[PDB]
């Protein structure tokens, strides 16, 4: 089984799972730890944000690859926004302080 791009989950905006659904392989916590041990920060960042969750990042990266430019925009994963909204729904105010 292989996948370049396809359908995404309607809640977390992540690629589906399983060969039947034409999903992508899951990069688990152990793989993240291995990447951190290797020190490949850029690979981990691109695999965490511009490949799975960042919708604008995904579209921009696809356009750049089609255009022949190998550059990315980290953006902001949608799962973190979902988590923030869920925690806010719990009565706890959590926000990102720019300062």
């Amino acid at each position: 089984h292989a996948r370049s791009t396809g359908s995404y989950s309607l809640v977390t905006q992540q690629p589906l799972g399983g060969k039947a659904q034409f999903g992508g392989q899951r990069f688990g916590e152990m793989e993240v730890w291995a990447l951190e041990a290797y020190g490949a920060a850029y690979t981990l960042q691109e695999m965490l944000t511009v490949k799975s969750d960042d919708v604008n990042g995904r579209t921009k990266m696809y356009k750049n690859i089609v255009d022949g430019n190998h550059q990315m925009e980290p953006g902001m994963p949608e799962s973190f926004n979902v988590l923030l909204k869920e925690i806010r729904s719990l009565g706890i105010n959590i926000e990102l302080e720019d300062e």
Partner: protein, 83 residues
């Protein structure tokens, strides 16, 4: 056309700034439309940048100085054209 980066690693001496400088040089060739200082035997941009780093043609301070000189000639020329 490259299998080991040990010589490049010891040339840079940090094995982490080497990745950054090689990425900057590869982006300079691929996006900026630059030219390589060494012949390419049908080599990818990253491999070309690594090979350039191997012989000392490309270095972080060297790249910064070259970029600053290019910027200086660029806006000096634009100022001359405007005036």
């Amino acid at each position: 056309a490259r299998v080991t980066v040990q010589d490049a690693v010891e040339k840079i001496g940090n094995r982490f700034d080497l990745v950054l400088v090689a990425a900057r040089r590869a982006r300079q060739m691929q996006v900026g439309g630059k030219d390589p200082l060494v012949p390419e035997e049908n080599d990818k941009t990253t491999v070309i940048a690594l090979r350039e780093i191997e012989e000392g043609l490309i270095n972080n301070q060297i790249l910064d100085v070259r970029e600053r000189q290019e910027q200086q000639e660029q806006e000096a020329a634009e100022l001359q054209a405007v005036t």
